[PDB]
Amino acid sequence: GQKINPHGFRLGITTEWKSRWYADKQYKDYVKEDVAIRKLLATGLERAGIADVEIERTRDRVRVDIHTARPGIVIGRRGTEADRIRADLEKLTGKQVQLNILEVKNPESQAQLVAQGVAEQLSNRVAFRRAMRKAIQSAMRQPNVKGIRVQCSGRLGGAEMSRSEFYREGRVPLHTLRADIDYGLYEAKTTFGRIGVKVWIYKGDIVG
Amino acid sequence: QRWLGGMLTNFSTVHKRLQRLKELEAMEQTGGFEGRTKKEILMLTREKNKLERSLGGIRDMQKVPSAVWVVDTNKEHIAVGEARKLGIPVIAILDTNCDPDVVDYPIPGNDDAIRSAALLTKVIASAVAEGLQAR
RNA sequence: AGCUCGUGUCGUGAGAUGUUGGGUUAAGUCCCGCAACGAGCGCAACCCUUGUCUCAUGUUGCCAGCACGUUAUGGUGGGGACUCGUGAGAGACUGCCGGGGUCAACUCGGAGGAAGGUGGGGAUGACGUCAAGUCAUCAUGCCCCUUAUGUCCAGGGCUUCACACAUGCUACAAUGGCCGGUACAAAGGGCUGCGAUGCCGUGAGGUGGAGCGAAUCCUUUCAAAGCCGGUCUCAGUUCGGAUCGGGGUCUGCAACUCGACCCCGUGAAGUCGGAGUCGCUAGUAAUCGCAGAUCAGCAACGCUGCGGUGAAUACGUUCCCG
RNA sequence: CGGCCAACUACGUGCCAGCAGCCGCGGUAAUACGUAGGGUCCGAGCGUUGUCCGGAAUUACUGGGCGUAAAGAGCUCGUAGGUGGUUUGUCGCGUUGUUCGUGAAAACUCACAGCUUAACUGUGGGCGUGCGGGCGAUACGGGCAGACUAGAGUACUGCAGGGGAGACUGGAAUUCCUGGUGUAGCGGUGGAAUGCGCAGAUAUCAGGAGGAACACCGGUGGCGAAGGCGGGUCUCUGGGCAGUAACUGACGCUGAGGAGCGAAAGCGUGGGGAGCGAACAGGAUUAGAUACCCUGGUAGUCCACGCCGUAAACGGUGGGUACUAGGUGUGGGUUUCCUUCCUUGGGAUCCGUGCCGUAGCUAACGCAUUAAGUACCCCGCCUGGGGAGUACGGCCGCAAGGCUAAAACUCAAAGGAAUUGACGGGGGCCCGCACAAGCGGCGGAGCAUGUGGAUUAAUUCGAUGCAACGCGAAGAACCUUAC
Ligand SMILES: [Mg+2]
Ligand SMILES: [Mg+2]
Ligand SMILES: [Mg+2]
Ligand SMILES: [Mg+2]
Ligand SMILES: [Mg+2]
Ligand SMILES: [Mg+2]
Ligand SMILES: [Mg+2]
Ligand SMILES: [Mg+2]
Ligand SMILES: [Mg+2]
Ligand SMILES: [Mg+2]
Ligand SMILES: [Mg+2]
Ligand SMILES: [Mg+2]
Ligand SMILES: [Mg+2]
Ligand SMILES: [Mg+2]
Ligand SMILES: [Mg+2]
Ligand SMILES: [Mg+2]
Ligand SMILES: [Mg+2]
Ligand SMILES: [Mg+2]
Ligand SMILES: [Mg+2]
Ligand SMILES: [Mg+2]
Ligand SMILES: [Mg+2]
Ligand SMILES: [Mg+2]
Ligand SMILES: [Mg+2]
Ligand SMILES: [Mg+2]
Ligand SMILES: [Mg+2]
Ligand SMILES: [Mg+2]
Ligand SMILES: [Mg+2]
Ligand SMILES: [Mg+2]
Ligand SMILES: [Mg+2]
Ligand SMILES: [Mg+2]
Ligand SMILES: [Mg+2]
Ligand SMILES: [Mg+2]
Ligand SMILES: [Mg+2]
Ligand SMILES: [Mg+2]
Ligand SMILES: [Mg+2]
Ligand SMILES: [Mg+2]
Ligand SMILES: [Mg+2]
Ligand SMILES: [Mg+2]
Ligand SMILES: [Mg+2]
Ligand SMILES: [Mg+2]
Ligand SMILES: [Mg+2]
Ligand SMILES: [Mg+2]
Ligand SMILES: [Mg+2]
Ligand SMILES: [Mg+2]
Ligand SMILES: [Mg+2]
Ligand SMILES: [Mg+2]
Ligand SMILES: [Mg+2]
Ligand SMILES: [Mg+2]
Ligand SMILES: [Mg+2]
Ligand SMILES: [Mg+2]
Ligand SMILES: [Mg+2]
Ligand SMILES: [Mg+2]
Ligand SMILES: [Mg+2]
Ligand SMILES: [Mg+2]
Ligand SMILES: [Mg+2]
Ligand SMILES: [Mg+2]
Ligand SMILES: [Mg+2]
Ligand SMILES: [Mg+2]
Ligand SMILES: [Mg+2]
Ligand SMILES: [Mg+2]
Ligand SMILES: [Mg+2]
Ligand SMILES: [Mg+2]
Ligand SMILES: [Mg+2]
Ligand SMILES: [Mg+2]
Ligand SMILES: [Mg+2]
Ligand SMILES: [Mg+2]
Ligand SMILES: [Mg+2]
Ligand SMILES: [Mg+2]
Ligand SMILES: [Mg+2]
Ligand SMILES: [Mg+2]
Ligand SMILES: [Mg+2]
Ligand SMILES: [Mg+2]
Ligand SMILES: [Mg+2]
Ligand SMILES: [Mg+2]
Ligand SMILES: [Mg+2]
Ligand SMILES: [Mg+2]
Ligand SMILES: [Mg+2]
Ligand SMILES: [Mg+2]
Ligand SMILES: [Mg+2]
Ligand SMILES: [Mg+2]
Ligand SMILES: [Mg+2]
Ligand SMILES: [Mg+2]
Ligand SMILES: [Mg+2]
Ligand SMILES: [Mg+2]
Ligand SMILES: [Mg+2]
Ligand SMILES: [Mg+2]
Ligand SMILES: [Mg+2]
Ligand SMILES: [Mg+2]
Ligand SMILES: [Mg+2]
Ligand SMILES: [Mg+2]
Ligand SMILES: [Mg+2]
Ligand SMILES: [Mg+2]
Ligand SMILES: [Mg+2]
Ligand SMILES: [Mg+2]
Ligand SMILES: [Mg+2]
Ligand SMILES: [Mg+2]
Ligand SMILES: [Mg+2]
Ligand SMILES: [Mg+2]
């Protein structure tokens, strides 16, 4: 191993929790229901990349927050996918649940969305060279973000060996705990096997 | 005081730091000093001193030169070398130990005597002033 | 503490410069001149804890100053004057002086101050190497079985043992074993769980079960080494506890392999250790306890953390390893 | 149908079966093997094989090099040949100056024309790149018929030098011998023992004997063609340098074959032989030493006469000539001027010898007037690495041996310079309980668990130095549990 998760490292200062509640009696069931519903959401929803999932729970009520680049397919104009998600939640008996859909302001500045896009491009036909060129240029087009790195590991091009290649551009202070690092990763599918994509996003710093 | 290597040849790099120095002057003239820690305040004052001391002419030239004038070319070979590399005409004082093909328009004289150096610089400055009035 | 990139220059070309040399620093940290100018990953800082003070602030916690206790102690009415605990803020920045220093970095000494020159310890692993470990955490391309290499229990073994290596525990005995008396800790767990007072047991534990989803109730008023008194006069020993047999408890449908704990007898072996070798420079080494945890019991001397008593030295890089 | 080289995917076995002109391709998932399709090239022909040229400037006349990759012979004298410093005079034998005069036919090249166009051939030209004689030229490139001198040599005066050979001679040191004095050790290496002593060592004084070589001066200095050359003195002698320039008036250069000199070692004969020192004995280290180390010491090292004729014989660069910017030292000699006329004072000149540097050259390091710069003249040497500087043959040598110098087979590379890591029993400047000073420990014995190894029907599986081993196992009567 080389590096720990930046999100875990800076989780105490600059970033905030996605799931917030307190439990001592049945916390095992709370967390197992949480992980089960997150697995079913990840399995069912693949066409639309779920950037973030957030839940806050008091007594019985639970409110799930879903962040996606676009909500058009996440929630239909009539609500078919919302009805399906509610049906899955009531099948696992998540009692009363209220869902919120929020669209991101800049899809290219979030780690998960660009990672999913690059993973899809690599999966279908797109070569890693052009895929990463497009991803990096779309990243640096945005003024707010400064430093970008993207990395992929595994069998590239179907060769019988493992390539670990990365591109860097800008400033990404991993060691600086003040640095606002946005971390994301995903496992892309391929006929020859699977390749992992790893991305770090630097967006300014916070003082206080 | 200090000749940066290839500042005329590599102008796109020093243009950014001219931008940076102008931005730092603009921010300093505002009066914001207590908004930053004294350590980085001292660091920025030191870099003000360094860059102001080593950078005097690109503040005022901007639009790149048309001719280059040099004194004591055997020590200042970097400037004349860049001048010939870029094709800019060269006018300089050649002493008894200087290469004559380096300067397009040589001016015989001494770089080692302050009297002669001051007089030659005053003569060329008078020529420049006459041209400036003549525009 | 090094690893790179953009522009430029030299050569023609691998490339070189930047990253060199002088000084300085724990460090590519800083300064001086230079075909270098700069930027990135680094490094320091930003995080947590710890060392102080001020404010805010009294219950299940403390008691300065008032009263009731009368043997059980703030126990009870009372109060922030302190710790107690947790918020905000301040405080180490060569802050100031002398001398060396290129008048530049930097260093020694000196006053204040709690700390002096990253105050202490953590989290924090740059590009990469060992085709390093993991298809028995998980996911997966290929091949293989599909009436079996699938499933279920017709019980058992993972712990067997002539021997070696590796890391620990307990010691080899008096700075001790044993017996009686006796004072100080931190943090933490508890729902189909922690478990009081009481009675019976040598003791595992049995009956019974208050208080608790928890500064409150249980983990004993959380102790051990620590102090006083008594023995042993150096013995294979009152050190040292295994081995085996005889008797019970506990979890459980059911303790033979193959559990743990309690009681007895059992008395073998061994006197600081062979070359070689390890770890430790301040709460450190060394020694004595407690707790998270998996769990129904349990091979729990373990991993992890929380504590208690608490040293010695550094003359300096010539030799060994990095 | 891997890249060279226009043309890719699937199916079948995997260090097997196999491909292939060079690199090179298969060790379960091949665009390189075999089969399928698909595409490419060519076509009544398509490939393989063999011979010949080109690229190969890879035999370099046009058109290569010799510092390190292959090469300067060891260096001179010098025969035959090749090549020449000015201008003063014919014949025209090196030669171009124009014309008539041959160049068989066929072929090549240009245009025409015919077989319907096609091969095929039909006609006339043109082409037919060399050589014959008669007529007309004289600038260079040769002999011949006469003079001068810028190369060269001589002549006059000086010059410095370890140049060579013979003889004579000096001091210090080592060893040995002789005689005092003087006592138990002396010599030795990282440590010790073989070695010599108690029969008198070592040490030290006096004397003598013999052999080798000349410390300082002594240097990146001198000379010689090169090997090389230095204690003095004498004897004879070579080479080189400056000035006056009197004289010779094309005598100059290099030089295949040939001949002479030549480091050390080796050989014969006859002498010498102090020190040193192959070989050989012991002592020492190592698992091992037939070496590095110690104690001894036979050839040789010295002399005279002959021999062999090889060296990283290096400046790894043949000689000679002319030209091309400088700076800083040394040696030798002529001059002139501040002028004391003392003075590395200053200047001019030629020769020799160090260092750094332009332009230039070179693949780079580097050379740079003492060229690897730009040229001229001649001579030797080289054509991928082994085989092999070897066999046979020839020549020389008494021999050791030396010179001349191959072929088969094999490899697809071997080599020169330079960039960056790694390593170092190469160095400097730094870090840590790394050592030093230390307490407490383990390694001797019980304990309670883990790992190898041996038994059993199973003893599940994984992790085996740092970075596994009271590790997953932070809980085995059913479960766990996979056998
Ligand atoms: Mg490193
Ligand atoms: Mg160029
Ligand atoms: Mg610099
Ligand atoms: Mg560097
Ligand atoms: Mg560099
Ligand atoms: Mg350099
Ligand atoms: Mg450094
Ligand atoms: Mg830096
Ligand atoms: Mg830092
Ligand atoms: Mg009180
Ligand atoms: Mg790194
Ligand atoms: Mg691997
Ligand atoms: Mg498997
Ligand atoms: Mg997988
Ligand atoms: Mg599978
Ligand atoms: Mg089992
Ligand atoms: Mg088992
Ligand atoms: Mg180990
Ligand atoms: Mg005991
Ligand atoms: Mg007691
Ligand atoms: Mg007590
Ligand atoms: Mg009792
Ligand atoms: Mg006992
Ligand atoms: Mg014993
Ligand atoms: Mg004893
Ligand atoms: Mg020892
Ligand atoms: Mg103990
Ligand atoms: Mg447990
Ligand atoms: Mg092809
Ligand atoms: Mg092709
Ligand atoms: Mg295949
Ligand atoms: Mg085809
Ligand atoms: Mg050919
Ligand atoms: Mg020619
Ligand atoms: Mg040639
Ligand atoms: Mg050679
Ligand atoms: Mg030669
Ligand atoms: Mg020869
Ligand atoms: Mg002749
Ligand atoms: Mg004629
Ligand atoms: Mg004629
Ligand atoms: Mg004719
Ligand atoms: Mg004819
Ligand atoms: Mg032709
Ligand atoms: Mg016709
Ligand atoms: Mg014809
Ligand atoms: Mg012809
Ligand atoms: Mg002639
Ligand atoms: Mg005359
Ligand atoms: Mg003459
Ligand atoms: Mg002389
Ligand atoms: Mg003689
Ligand atoms: Mg005597
Ligand atoms: Mg004597
Ligand atoms: Mg003798
Ligand atoms: Mg005359
Ligand atoms: Mg001659
Ligand atoms: Mg000749
Ligand atoms: Mg000749
Ligand atoms: Mg000859
Ligand atoms: Mg010859
Ligand atoms: Mg002869
Ligand atoms: Mg002879
Ligand atoms: Mg000799
Ligand atoms: Mg000899
Ligand atoms: Mg012999
Ligand atoms: Mg002889
Ligand atoms: Mg003899
Ligand atoms: Mg000897
Ligand atoms: Mg010897
Ligand atoms: Mg003998
Ligand atoms: Mg011997
Ligand atoms: Mg030879
Ligand atoms: Mg020689
Ligand atoms: Mg020669
Ligand atoms: Mg010549
Ligand atoms: Mg000269
Ligand atoms: Mg040049
Ligand atoms: Mg060149
Ligand atoms: Mg030069
Ligand atoms: Mg020359
Ligand atoms: Mg040449
Ligand atoms: Mg051989
Ligand atoms: Mg040969
Ligand atoms: Mg023969
Ligand atoms: Mg021969
Ligand atoms: Mg080389
Ligand atoms: Mg080098
Ligand atoms: Mg330290
Ligand atoms: Mg030590
Ligand atoms: Mg031990
Ligand atoms: Mg032990
Ligand atoms: Mg196993
Ligand atoms: Mg191991
Ligand atoms: Mg370990
Ligand atoms: Mg253990
Ligand atoms: Mg086991
Ligand atoms: Mg079972």
Curated annotation (Swiss-Prot), chain A:
Chain ranges of the KH type-2 domain: 37-105
Ribonucleoprotein in keyword set: yes
A GO term for molecular function: structural constituent of ribosome
Residue ranges that the Swiss-Prot or TrEMBL entry lists as coiled coil: none
GO biological process assignments: translation
GO cellular component terms, A-Z: cytosolic small ribosomal subunit
Record's keyword terms, sorted: Ribonucleoprotein, Ribosomal protein, RNA-binding, rRNA-binding
Keyword Iron-sulfur: no
Function, in words: Binds the lower part of the 30S subunit head. Binds mRNA in the 70S ribosome, positioning it for translation.
Subunit-structure text: Part of the 30S ribosomal subunit. Forms a tight complex with proteins S10 and S14.
Miscellaneous remark of the record: Binds 2-aminothiazole antibiotics, which are antitubercular agents.
Family: Belongs to the universal ribosomal protein uS3 family.
Protein name: Small ribosomal subunit protein uS3
Range of the intact protein held here: 2 to 209 of 275
Swiss-Prot record, chain B:
Signal peptide start and end residues: none
Homology family: Belongs to the universal ribosomal protein uS2 family.
Protein name stated in the entry: Small ribosomal subunit protein uS2
Organism: Mycolicibacterium smegmatis (strain ATCC 700084 / mc(2)155)
Gene (UniProt): rpsB
Range of the intact protein held here: 94 to 228 of 277
